[PDB]
Amino acid sequence: DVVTVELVEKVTKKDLNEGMMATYWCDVFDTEGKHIGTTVGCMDILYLVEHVAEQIRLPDGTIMAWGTMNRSDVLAQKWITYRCQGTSGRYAGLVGTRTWRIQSLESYPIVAKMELRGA
Amino acid sequence: DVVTVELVEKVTKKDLNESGSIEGFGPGMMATYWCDVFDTEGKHIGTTVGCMDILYADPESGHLVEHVAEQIRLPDGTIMAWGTMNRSDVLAQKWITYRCQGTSGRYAGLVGTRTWRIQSLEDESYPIVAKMELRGALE
């Protein structure tokens, strides 16, 4: 049985070291625009190919996600797929995908779709 | 066949959640950080960036259990590391074991462990010794 979560996330903070690297924070909203959690993440630009590892906190548990994105695909508003794994609460033990894209081609909020199930 | 890397890492920047961010909880629930990475001869050779989330308090103790995901950039490649730790163990200067895998360069294709310990709590950069041991994922 799949667990499915649709989110909207907006960046509130980003630090960079200008192989650029970054850390960031996002507000997480449900589809009704209600504020329900937070994402923290880090990024390293491998070759432009970026590699992300992040953690998402939701009212009922926590998830880690990770993956590799081409910068230009993000900017074309293509769907990016990260792998993810529940780390606590309702998501514990579950694995799946976090598929997301820039919602609006400015502040660049994203829509993200998480699907997890037993491993 | 085993690749071993020994580092010292020291925090240079940290941010934690602010009041009002996380409903019902104060700063401390989540963090991002940066560290300077040094070799065993003490030369500055790279950077680590990371994030932390509190999972829960251990009902058997009251101790905080946290989860970390981080990335380390070295002159010859990059590694991703992640894991859960009990903060009691960390502050007691026990050795903490995280999983890690290479993401580029010399470490591409490699998997193993990142075992670390705080070298000093007095030093507000909380220097750690980290020992990474990696082997080929391909059997």
Residue numbers in the entry:
A (entry chain B): 9 to 26, 36 to 64, 72 to 129, 132 to 145
B (entry chain A): 9 to 147
Q: Can you list sentences taken from the study reporting this PDB entry?
A:
The structure reveals an asymmetric unit comprising two molecules of Cyc15 (Chain A and Chain B), which form a homodimer. Chain A comprises residues 9–148 of the full‐length polypeptide, with Chain B comprising residues 9–145. The AlphaFold search model aligns well with our experimentally determined crystal structure with a Cα RMSD of 0.47 Å. The Cyc15 dimer interface is populated predominantly by hydrophobic residues, along with a pair of equivalently positioned cysteines (Cys59; one contributed by each monomer) which sit 5 Å apart. Each Cyc15 monomer houses a large, solvent exposed active site cavity, which is sealed at one end by a salt bridge formed between the residues Glu17 and Arg122. Access to this site is regulated via a flexible loop, formed by the β1‐β2 linker (residues Asn25‐Met36), which caps the opposing end of the barrel. In our Cyc15 crystal structure electron density is only observed for the capping loop of Chain A, which is packed tightly against a symmetry partner. As a consequence of this arrangement, the side chain of Glu132 from each copy of Chain A extends into the entrance of the central cavity of a symmetry partner, forcing the recipients capping loop into an ‘open’ conformation. The Cyc15 active site is populated by a combination of hydrophobic and aromatic amino acids consistent with the required local environment for promotion of the [4+2] cycloaddition. Docking studies indicate a mode of substrate binding consistent with the formation of the diastereomer 3, providing a structural explanation for the observed stereochemical output of the Cyc15 catalysed reaction.
The hypothetical protein Cyc15 was found to catalyse an intramolecular cycloaddition to generate a novel spirotetronate. Cyc15 shares 28 % sequence identity with AbyU and was identified in the draft genome of Streptomyces sp. NL15‐2 K as a hypothetical protein. The overall fold of Cyc15 is analogous to those reported for other spirotetronate cyclases, possessing an eight‐stranded antiparallel β‐barrel fold with (+1) 8 topology. Mechanistic studies indicate that these enzymes accelerate [4+2] cycloadditions via an asynchronous concerted mechanism, consistent with a formal Diels‐Alder reaction.
